[PDB]
Every structure is written in C-alpha cells, then in structure tokens.
Design a protein around this nucleic acid. Structure first.
Length: 257
DNA sequence: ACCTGAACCGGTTTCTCACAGC
DNA sequence: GCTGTGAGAAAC
RNA sequence: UCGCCUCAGAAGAUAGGGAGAAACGGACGUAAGCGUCAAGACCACCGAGGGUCACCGUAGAUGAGUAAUCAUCUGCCCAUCUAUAUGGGUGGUUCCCGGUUCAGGU
C-alpha cells in the first residue's frame, strides 16, 4: 500500500552545494566498497583457478572456505554496516588527524598529497552519516544482487559486473530515512538555519517539505494531497533525492494505513 | 543525456553537545 | 544562568 | 497568422532570444569545439544572494507574516456518488508510484 509523492525540488545555491557534496560522498563510499569487493574476488578466482588443476568437488571447497572464515580475512566480503564500521570511520579519523596535525603550521605534503588520493584536503569526517551510508547501501545492494543473479534466484539475463561510478556517466541519488524529522505542512523547522534566525517554527502552507539536516526545501508541486493523506492515518517513511541532467527531484514514500 | 528492458522492492536505535527562552 | 528538547554521530 | 529550442512537476489558456512567410529553421561571442543569455512581485546587503506565487468559482469572518502570499470555517452556484422526489459528501479542468542495478540502442 505504498505510494510515492515525487516533487520537483526548488533548492538554492546553499542547498544545491550540499546536494552535490552528498552525491559525491555517496559515490566515493560506493567506489571504496566496490573496489574492496573487486580485489577480494580477484584473489578468490585466482585461488579457485590455481586449485582447479587437481580435480575437486563443490562440497569440499565449500567446507574449506567455511573453515577459512576465521583467519586471513582476505577471503571475506562485507556488507554496508560491517565495511562502514571497519574501514570508513578509521578513514574519518585519518582525515580528522590530518586536520588535528595541520591546525597551526605543519607539513601537509607528508600528511596529505594529491598523488595517491584525488582529494585536495580531508573531508570525509565532516560528512553526514546518512549520506555516507547511502553509498554503502547501494554498493552492498548491487553486489548482493549480482551474487543472487548468478546462483539460482534472479530470472532473466546474466547481470554484468558492478561498474565504478563516475561524475557524469552514472546516476546521482541518495536516500535519507526516518525517524529523522521530515514532512510537509504540520512539521517543525531546524535550529540554527537561516529560517530559524527569523524565528519561524512550523510549516503553515503547502509548498515546503522538511529534509533533515538540509533544512526545509521548497517544491514546484503542491503538498495539499500529501497533507490530506497525512491526516488520515498515513505517515511518511523516507525521502530519496535524485538528479536528472541539472534537475533535482525528491520522492516522499508514504505508507497509507 | 535519453531512453528500453527487465527484475525486484519501499531503515531503526542510542548516546552526547548546544542553544533557548525565558 | 538552567535543564529538557532537538540535532547529529556511531553502530548496525 | 504560423512554430524550432527556453520558465511554469505532464498535457490544454499567459510570458521568454532570435527568426521566417501555412512551409522552412534555435541564438550570441569565439571543420570545429567551448563558454554565455533568454518567466513577473515584495523586503533584505555592497550587479550578488533569500523567501512567495506562475494550481485552487463566487461573497464574509478572524488565524501566521514588516509583505508578497497563505490557512481554517460560514453564506451561494455547478458537477459528481449512495439509501428510501428527499437526506447526506466529494471537489472547483484532468493525471501521476517511485527507487536500485546491470545489458543494450540512440
């Protein structure tokens, strides 16, 4: 019983900048996860081929791989959460230390250089957790989708290999969930935003939606159907922000009940 | 960038700062 | 000037 | 009088940069690229940034806002459904369900 109210956003420069930073962060996390999986499976297939010279069955190799799930973790694949905890906030702390050691005078070239990493300065620790973990969501979904397509589950043609996303070749989009604060008419603002400096506290019309740490953003549509659905026993679930060419869209997933 | 084309599905929970509304 | 409430990180 | 791109979430009324004479064809600067400009109203700062509409027939009330605009009820009109000429109830031109990934063609 799920609908989707797809509004066309009407953001401004200060909000489009955060949207671009968000899609960049999701893409960057997507790339790290897919790379980790890719050069884990390269070793996987090299080992499988190098042990294929001697005839082996499928149960024996499965038992061996299961027994190799405690040591030499190079034979393991990670979800969004496990990879996040194990390799993302370590790198967030690495970025933080790279600022905690350039505070007032230091050598940044020995700490951060644009040779092995295309970042001008560290920025991964000042990125919102929701946006960052969205890329983990997408990458884990793609890899599980393909390993389900292979074995026995997904009907249709064989499904490719996960391709590294690029700026202008792939899709830009991130999902931000509840129980964060979001919604149409009848919802409160954010403390500290330029619309809270003026003191305004609640949405009292039909051309605004609430988008978490991004503030409250306008729409091209009208939210009267959304609010009239809300006052029947129906509550929003998440919001997905997406880009098409130079246009931004937001989907509000409502669950009527 | 613009589509098919198809196949599948639609987020919770907790602990720690910083105004705030007098 | 004080303490619940909101906003955001962290795990997951 | 016509219509190729451009602003109004998509199609039918009103605005945008230049042309054509119901036919053809986006523009400017610099065989090519590249960059840039194209919707009106109110306050805010020294041509730059932020909110409001570009959906809601027709008359009132008082709600939020320095204000553009907006909200909720009460009169009238029209359209649309059910139960037995009457009671109610739904609107003010209609439509909308979107995310993820890969393989293709343009």
């Amino acid at each position: 019983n799920l609908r989707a109210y797809k509004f066309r956003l009407d953001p401004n420069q200060a909000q489009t900048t955060a949207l671009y930073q968000a899609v960049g962060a999701a893409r960057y996390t997507y790339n790290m996860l897919t790379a980790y999986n890719l050069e884990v499976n390269r070793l996987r297939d090299d080992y499988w081929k190098r042990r294929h010279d001697e005839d082996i069955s499928d149960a024996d190799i499965k038992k061996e791989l299961n027994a190799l799930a405690k040591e030499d973790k190079r034979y393991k694949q990670l979800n969004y959460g496990a990879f996040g905890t194990q390799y993302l906030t370590p790198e967030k702390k690495r970025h933080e230390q790279a600022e905690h050691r350039i505070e007032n005078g230091e050598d940044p070239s020995v700490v951060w250089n644009q040779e092995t990493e295309r970042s001008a300065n560290p920025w991964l620790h000042t990125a919102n957790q929701r946006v960052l973990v969205s890329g983990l969501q997408n990458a884990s979904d793609a890899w599980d989708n393909f390993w389900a397509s292979r074995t026995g589950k997904r009907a249709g043609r064989l499904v490719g290999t996960p391709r590294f996303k690029k700026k202008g070749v792939s899709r830009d989009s991130f999902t931000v969930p509840a129980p964060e604060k979001m919604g149409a008419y009848g919802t409160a603002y954010l403390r500290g935003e330029p619309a809270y400096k003026q003191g305004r506290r609640k949405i009292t019309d039909y051309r605004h939606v609430r988008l978490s740490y991004l503030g409250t953003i306008r729409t091209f549509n009208s939210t009267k159907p959304l609010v009239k659905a809300v006052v029947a026993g129906a509550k929003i679930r998440s919001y997905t922000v997406s880009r098409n060419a130079d246009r931004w869209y937001v989907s509000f997933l409502v669950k009527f009940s």
